[PDB]
Ligand binder design. Structure first.
Ligand SMILES: [Ca+2]
Ligand SMILES: [Ca+2]
Ligand SMILES: [Ca+2]
Ligand SMILES: [Ca+2]
Ligand SMILES: [Ca+2]
Ligand SMILES: [Ca+2]
Lengths: 178, 178
């Protein structure tokens, strides 16, 4: 059934975009926060990434943690598959941050650091057009289509709490924190 | 560094458990809700699962959606890797539900359906011991260790909003919904 298929596919697309949105927020925090604890995790990643690739193999991650003196869970391979959230087979910087930087540790300041990038115009509200340009252009400027805007609108609907079609700081924080 | 490694590993374990907790909640909703919209998604999965295995290959999912008349995104393979959240290579029932059943569509009734399973004793609060027994024993009864309880405690800390070490309905709903 087609009609049912439509809603299924669109929900799938939404699931993926929401994952992308949170991972990009985490990456923005790692790049822009200047927070000591975050910087120290970035130092760990530097140590693990022994070839300077920007990503680490599952072997490198295991060996690197073992070199620290840790006893890994026997089920660590399943965990590594979960950390590899894009399924590429390797753990990139963004995935390492997104699993190692506990959401609980994200203070208001850290979450604001990401919020203010998505809120391009700094009015306190992330709009569909702002979010689409960050996700699809990487920056404030550039071409996006009404289909793109509609896709992002559907994703705002999952985060919005006051039915205004925009994401405020509170709403954003409730997405970032469980 | 060992000390830093410890906190990294424990955060990784937490990330994985939180994913497990949400996916199990979704599965409980699919099994126990008796909600028409959820039942209709379950009918879709039955159609896709043509060999009656309980899981579908990426090919089966693509072909099945194409048979519905849908135009899949050219990047659907990346999406499928994201849906395959355990990295097994195939999409099981639980993953299909967890991506197709939009969180937005989870009414109070649907979320309560999962809540009351984790709140084994029905006192309105999910405790560490209750959650550990559901995650590790599958049911209320059975052996778990203090290490197990400590692992679950660390995960409650990510969901708790009033510092009581227990998860109430509101807190649970804030985990389930973005
Ligand atoms: Ca990856
Ligand atoms: Ca704005
Ligand atoms: Ca809003
Ligand atoms: Ca799978
Ligand atoms: Ca209870
Ligand atoms: Ca609580």
């Amino acid at each position: 059934l087609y009609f049912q298929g439509i809603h299924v596919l669109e929900n799938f697309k939404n699931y993926g975009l929401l994952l992308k949105f949170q991972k990009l927020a985490m990456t923005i925090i790692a790049q822009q926060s200047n927070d000591y604890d975050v910087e120290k995790l970035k130092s760990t990643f530097l140590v693990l990434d022994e070839d300077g690739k920007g990503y680490i193999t599952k072997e490198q991650l295991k060996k690197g943690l073992e070199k620290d003196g840790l006893k890994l869970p026997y089920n660590f391979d399943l965990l590594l598959d979960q950390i590899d959230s894009d399924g590429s087979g390797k753990i990139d910087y963004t995935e390492f941050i997104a699993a190692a930087l506990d959401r609980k540790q994200l203070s208001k300041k850290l979450i604001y650091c990401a919020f203010r990038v998505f809120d391009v115009d700094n009015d306190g509200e992330i709009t569909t057009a702002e979010l689409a340009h960050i996700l699809y252009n990487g920056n404030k400027k550039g071409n996006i289509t009404q289909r793109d805007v509609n896709r992002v609108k559907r994703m705002i609907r999952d985060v919005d709490k006051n039915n205004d079609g925009k994401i405020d700081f509170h709403e954003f924080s409730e997405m970032m924190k469980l």
